[model samples]
Target: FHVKSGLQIKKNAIIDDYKVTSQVLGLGINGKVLQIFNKRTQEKFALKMLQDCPKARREVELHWRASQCPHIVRIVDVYENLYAGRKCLLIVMECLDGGELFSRIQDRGDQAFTEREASEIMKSIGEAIQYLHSINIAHRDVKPENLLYTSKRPNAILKLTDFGFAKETTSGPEKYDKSCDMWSLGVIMYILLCGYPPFYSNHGLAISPGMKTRIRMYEFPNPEWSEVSEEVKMLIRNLLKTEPTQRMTITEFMNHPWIMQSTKVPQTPLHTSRVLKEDKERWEDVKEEMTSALATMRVDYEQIKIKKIEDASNPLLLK
Candidate 1:
């Protein structure tokens, strides 16, 4: 059981053992995930071992806080261990071996989910998001990487994972906002139907910081709105609006036609290889253009200071 970094325990590692057999699932960005099986109870689970760092600590705290929500990833157990002279945290929870939406899309190529299927998945995600927002929490990171699916009968069940950047804001009257989560949901929905994010880069000209800012406070351009249904496209536009007030609320979003009709899954279109490649390239081009536009709109720190002074000087106009 002893190996390079750590020792692998058998099916029953401890005396009062759960009789669990552990297997390495895969490697994450910052940690390793393992699939665990309970021989006695015939139950399966997952364990994520995160590298100990400031980021890991923040993630642990966020996960612990978010564990209060049933829709979010359940934190069954959390403990620390030594690995290569560094501390690592092990998180245990239910496993979703169906893989990520990203891999699913890549496997399907240009053929993305039909509007009905997309709506079903979106509604499930929106329900999870609604629960998070109802508790005054915002999942800052809501991309496909954080979404997991089940391999059971109802293959449509999607679970939201990775709470490292989730923020809680239940204390004061206006502590934090859930608008960021709404924007992320919009991006997720867009990718589900189109097989790509609203903002992407093909030419590699899109800067990382600028892309992040635009993702948080920008809208998708209309030029890329071909082939998608009007109702679904309109929902994307509304969710990704720059102004938070203009964005759709969780309740209103649930009432939308897309969600209401999503239960009846539709057949996906068969996209040729050429079409898929062309769509990818087009998405990248759009992303680069959007990034360039954002760069043009950027303001220097000095300019912001001057604008603040001018606004403060006009006291009568402030109100």
Candidate 2:
């Protein structure tokens, strides 16, 4: 009797099947993602080169398992090869042409970004997180950068990528597993609605490594968040809870009224596009801060030290 096979790592030279190029696609947690072409169909694909190891294998295997979900970036193939005398793992994946989420929103020059659209995008992201949680996996690094789109078209499908920080264990850490994803969802939703993150350090200082579990209280400032609903704000508060036990689960999130009735959500025009475009000069710093803050937030519960959210000031509001 034949049995179902596990992930098959192709041993043949990747170059034999695809024409590898010097062109860079983007950077992931592991390495530079390059643009490659299928020799037979001449179709474009993404290539990620990883030095084969236990950690690399985990990333590949976990990503392979999660690839079947529609909201996740699909892994086309994996090849074990030697490049420049070093053992490498070349991963072939579907190429996403649509740029980063914020960039897309910022580029919407004249068209007003609406609350309904933000709800739809958040639902798409929730679907990805829901699928991951269903399979007992946690996408630990669920930030804006890891979220990409299939194409540059109006109907591009948003999908999650970068499995370097993913874990197969659900309740692996008291402060760190799936709940972290919920916090990330909250942060992204906050940004989607207003074009700025909910929390940040003052004067370009790095967030203290030990300062985890402290709720950096945010404001719903006038003009940007004025038109947004109270129900949505409450939902954001639930998702952004500093306590892991208090955060909303993906199932609960997907079932919430706003997410459930995505189309029915108010079409209130948001300040997202205008705000993002106006502050384009400081966008890089904003992203970098979000990146570092997220990474530092993953510390253990025992290591966490709480700080007063009152001590924090909103630089975004100042501008």
Candidate 3:
């Protein structure tokens, strides 16, 4: 019989003759993550089991390749189970105690980040991205939610996780360089400093379709610049540049005044309550604007259909 939801495996469940303890963490669209403990070694690891699809197999390969990098998440083991004519691929890896950076920031609130603290976070990320680019791997998905942290000695070091969209760079180079990673780093830096992303829509959706164009147009200004230093502002500007090549290089990033030692280092203690209060107020203002815009706007699906037909007829529309 195929294993279905709510299937319980005891603490000492034996799978493939290996004594293991399994606790289902959660389920994604096509797979699930289980926190497992080895009975022999007493070590814990996370196991991701896919629903046996072509995409899952491809992801396994990508995960294996990405695991080779120490900075990235590692894949400890893989297994296959055939039950009721259905095959499932299980991948085991390290269990991260610290959750995603997005959750951390949300939990801690805006005050969690100081000017110096934000710079340090970005610096570590920059180094990791530099190493990834050197290895010819491009992390297309570089969001705050994807960055993971471990609470080890010498402060918590950020680990770049989630390699689902990662791709290896081939010969002749890509038209758009991997420098897009810098744009993501910039967004993270912006959030750390300003408490929110530069181009967010108030509709509760993560990102709108026109977000790229909005970012390219530089439609919004950095709200936190009033409190940050000129050097930090300059760094943000360079990173948020529309052109990937125009973005600051990793070398230039290290030399930037914000990243370098400076006499003025902001060291304010993070106050989660205060930050949440401010954010709530700002969100309320944005919510009103969004409501007003939605109330006044009307959709023109017919017009869009006609435009598509016209574009298909005229080659100039391809531009």
- Listed per candidate, the RMSD to the true structure in angstroms reads 12.8, 12.7, 12.0
- lDDT for model 1, please: 0.57
Q: What is the C-alpha lDDT of each candidate?
A: 0.57, 0.77, 0.55
Which candidate number would show the highest lDDT if scored against the true structure? 2
> Compared with the true structure, what per-residue lDDT tens digits does model 3 show for residues 59-115?
566656556455676677666665336666666777766776545555553445556
The digit string of per-residue lDDT tens for model 1 on 1-319 reads: 2232222223222213332232232243255566665446757777777776766766676666566555566766565555446666666677777766544544554455466666777888888888877766666666656787766334445778877666664552222246556666766666556554556444545654234544532323344443444655565545553432465677777777667666664554423223335566664554454435434433322233333333366677836
Which portions of model 2 miss their true places by more than 4 Å? 1-5, 22-30, 171-175, 200-217, 223-227, 299-319
Per-residue lDDT for 279-313 in model 2, tens only? 88677767776678668666433356777655447
Every model's TM-score: 0.63, 0.83, 0.65
User: What TM value does model 3 have?
Assistant: 0.65
Q: Would you list the clashing residue pairs of candidate 2?
A: none
Estimate candidate 2's alpha-carbon lDDT, on a 0 to 1 scale: 0.77
Clashing pairs in 3: none
| Shift in Å, residue 137, candidate 2 | 0.9
How far residue 302's Cα lies from its native spot in candidate 2, in Å, is: 16
